């Protein structure tokens, strides 16, 4: 019954589309980013990557049993960490840069200590308790981490204790992606039930549910100001939702795009929305007008992960091609 | 790379590359198999005789060949969202219990076989089909007819006819016979038989892949 009430409220608050309001601003124009660095050394399909807050180091996890830490400026490998399970499907980089985390078809999340006095990266802790593959993980502090899994639930962990302080439930299917708010007080998750939910980390309960996708949501990203996020699903469209309005603002789709999105990211100012595709291309979108500003066509197999530096200087794109390209 | 410690970093990177290449060479010499089948299909005995909380990895060596078997059936999560991780496995091992007339359960096994075999990732991957628990199946067929599972089965209620019928129903599910082959084995108690069948199937797969590469297949 309340579904009708929610739909009625949403239609009541819907007066003008984002496209019409943004018709008054000039277009971005052609965005011709060129590959500045090609990070090679992974011998299998790359499934996730993450930038360091210094906007110079980045970690990439692949299914060859290794996740490597690169010096993006010089392409040097700072670390190469062997994994007990080679089915890593995600990776993360602590805001302080001290730790990294990863997980996969083994339902545990492994946290690695990069600053060990012994000079080698050690497994700080293994977080177990999920009953499905780990889809995503994101650090809040050096002691807290939030993870999502095909268990259809997300959980907040106390790394020191090793137990999940809070468990987030409500998804009807595998949770495929997750994104922390800029202040790390809220996060959103995309699941295979074609819905996204906004969670209160402190309270541990869902705030809002966003629908509109026709297939599993593979990727999700927060708009830089923290009041909106963009989802990318298998129906070959990205979508932008606003938390305050609890509504869809704009969808980013094109007729000749017939494959699903695997990744989503925003530029520092939020004007450009970048999304990876199974068409082994990344399409840059004018976030305000839905126009495709450019295409980062440099990969062969599939773009499975991409991210923009906190500095806004560059965007890296990993792929099943086993290479990461840095565009600027 | 023009300072004292910006050159040591490059040397460290070169050493890391060396180790990565060595590990990749080491891991390319291991045959990778995907093990599938329902919980009651007898996968447990198969794994036990091979070796004698999500994915379970099993390593075993038979006649100079290293096998890695990935038992994925432990997790209930959606299959289409991680099955592509196993693209490139040499072969798929599918376990079926011939005594599956209880729940039928044979129908579920057939649906799973059809789903896996005709997957777009496994277009070229062959399947090593194991039809386990033939003894209890022989007790059951005497006790109950196969018509309880296959009403269209007009043949006699004997081991040979029913087993051949089951094999034909399973091998008829692959829509790309021109690309892949199915190796069907009625699992025997002798442990060596199953590992020998796996070795034979994998050897034939490798030989036929080489023949395809040479343009002779």
């Amino acid at each position: 019954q309340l579904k009708n009430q929610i739909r009625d409220a949403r239609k009541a608050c819907a007066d003008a589309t984002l496209s019409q309001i943004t018709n008054n601003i000039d277009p971005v124009g052609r965005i011709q980013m060129r590959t500045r660095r090609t990070l090679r050394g992974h011998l299998a399909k790359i499934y996730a990557m993450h930038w360091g807050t210094d906007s110079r180091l980045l970690v990439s996890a692949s299914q060859d049993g290794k996740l490597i830490i690169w010096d993006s400026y010089t392409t040097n490998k700072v670390h190469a960490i062997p994994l007990r399970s080679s089915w890593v499907m995600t990776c993360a980089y602590a805001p302080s840069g001290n730790y990294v985390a990863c997980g996969g078809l083994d339902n545990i999340c492994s946290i690695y200590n990069l600053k060990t006095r012994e000079g080698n990266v050690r497994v700080s802790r293994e977080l177990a308790g999920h009953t499905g593959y780990l889809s995503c993980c994101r650090f809040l502090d050096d002691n807290q981490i939030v993870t999502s899994s095909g268990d259809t639930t997300c959980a907040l962990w106390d790394i020191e204790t090793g137990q999940q302080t809070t468990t987030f439930t409500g998804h009807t299917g595998d949770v495929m992606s997750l994104s922390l708010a800029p202040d790390t007080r809220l996060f959103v998750s995309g699941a295979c039930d074609a819905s996204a939910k906004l969670w209160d980390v402190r309270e541990g309960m869902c705030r809002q549910t966003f629908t509109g996708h026709e297939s599993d949501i593979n990727a999700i990203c927060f708009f830089p100001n923290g009041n909106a996020f963009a989802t990318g699903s298998d129906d070959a469209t990205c979508r932008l939702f606003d938390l305050r309005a609890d509504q869809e603002l704009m969808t980013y789709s094109h007729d000749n795009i017939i494959c699903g999105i695997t990744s989503v990211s925003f530029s520092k100012s939020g004007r450009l929305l970048l999304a990876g595709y199974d068409d082994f291309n990344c399409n840059v979108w004018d976030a305000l007008k839905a126009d495709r500003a450019g295409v980062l066509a440099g990969h062969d197999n599939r773009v499975s992960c991409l991210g923009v530096t906190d500095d806004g200087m560059a965007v890296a794109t990993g792929s099943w091609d086993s290479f990461l390209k840095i565009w600027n | 790379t023009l300072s004292a410690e910006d050159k040591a970093a490059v040397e460290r990177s070169k050493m890391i590359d060396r180790n990565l290449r060595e590990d990749g060479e080491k891991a390319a010499r291991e045959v990778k198999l995907l093990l599938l089948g329902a919980g009651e299909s007898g996968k447990n005995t198969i794994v036990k005789q091979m070796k004698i909380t999500g994915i379970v990895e099993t390593h075993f060596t038979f006649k100079d060949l290293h096998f890695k078997m990935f038992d994925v059936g432990a997790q209930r999560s959606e299959r289409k969202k991680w099955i592509h991780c196993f693209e490139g496995v040499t072969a798929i091992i599918f376990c079926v219990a011939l005594s599956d007339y209880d729940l039928n359960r044979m129908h579920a096994s057939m649906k799973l076989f059809d789903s896996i075999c005709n997957n777009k990732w496994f277009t070229d991957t062959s399947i090593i089909l194991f039809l386990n628990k033939k003894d209890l199946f022989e007790e059951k067929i005497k006790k109950s007819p196969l018509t309880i599972c296959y009403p269209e089965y007009a043949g006699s209620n004997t081991y040979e006819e029913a087993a051949a019928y089951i094999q034909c129903q399973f091998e008829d599910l692959n829509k790309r016979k021109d690309t892949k082959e199915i190796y069907t084995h009625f699992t025997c108690s002798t442990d060596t038989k199953n590992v020998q069948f796996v070795f034979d199937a994998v050897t034939d797969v490798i030989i036929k892949n080489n023949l395809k590469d040479c343009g002779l297949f």
Partner: single-chain antibody, 228 residues
Framework: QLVESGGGLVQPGGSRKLSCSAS????????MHWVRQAPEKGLEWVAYISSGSGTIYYADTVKGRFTISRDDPKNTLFLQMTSLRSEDTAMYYCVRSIYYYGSSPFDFWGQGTTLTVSDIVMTQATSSVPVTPGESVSISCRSSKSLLHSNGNTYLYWFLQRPGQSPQLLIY???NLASGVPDRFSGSGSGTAFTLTISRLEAEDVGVYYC?????????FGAGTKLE
């Protein structure tokens, strides 16, 4: 921890093998240095061997006479010394050093072993600086050549050698503070002139402060400024 052995009385023109047993860390990943110190003089870098032994460097005053090698399986570092002169008499330290973006070379120093045979010039302004606890002190240094590299890193290092103890890294690359160093110490400077500032000095800060450049391979040290 690093433990060194092999020193003692030596006749001139002889030979001696100094060894360092490394335990408690991944010896194979660290590049290792030998740093010596005459009985009453400052530190002098001797030789360097990288991880995997791919790169070896020697001081101009030891090249050809001194040989450095590793035993990674046994985690032991060696220094073969031949045709030892009288000037070779010095305490020899083995210094841990790992190079990657953001690392802190020279972080851990061994306890040293005494041997007794019976270039960017860097100058430190003052030799002795009387002080009492609670005061703020500044140690000054100067280099003949600019230590600022094209990549922005100023390769200056500060080491504190308390009386009767081996040197411990204080600051690396002129700004960064080594792990475990009290927040009292702060490093600053630019180009060819640098300073080390100690705020609310305590009794444990008494010692000799040595400056070192890591811009080029000879790894020159300063004369050393004493606080007392």
């Amino acid at each position: 921890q690093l433990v060194e052995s092999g020193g003692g009385l030596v006749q001139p023109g002889g030979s001696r093998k100094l060894s360092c047993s490394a335990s408690g860390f991944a010896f194979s990943s660290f590049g290792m240095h030998w740093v010596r110190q005459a009985p009453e003089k400052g530190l002098e870098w001797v030789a360097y061997i990288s991880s995997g032994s791919g790169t070896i460097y020697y001081a101009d005053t030891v090249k050809g006479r001194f040989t450095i090698s590793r035993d990674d399986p046994k985690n032991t570092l060696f220094l073969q010394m031949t045709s030892l002169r009288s000037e070779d008499t010095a305490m020899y330290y083995c210094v841990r050093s790992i190079y990657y973006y953001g690392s802190s070379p020279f972080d851990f120093w061994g306890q040293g072993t005494t041997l007794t045979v019976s270039d960017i010039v860097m100058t430190q302004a003052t030799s002795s600086v009387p002080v009492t606890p609670g005061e703020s002190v500044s140690i000054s240094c100067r280099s003949s050549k600019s230590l600022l590299h094209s990549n922005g890193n100023t390769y200056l290092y500060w080491f504190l050698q308390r009386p009767g103890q081996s040197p411990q890294l204080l600051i690396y690359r002129m700004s960064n503070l080594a792990s475990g160093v009290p927040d009292r110490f702060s490093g600053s400077g630019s180009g060819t002139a640098f300073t080390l500032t100690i705020s609310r000095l305590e009794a444990e800060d008494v010692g000799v402060y040595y400056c070192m450049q890591h811009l080029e391979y000879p790894l020159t040290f300063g004369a050393g400024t004493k606080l007392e």
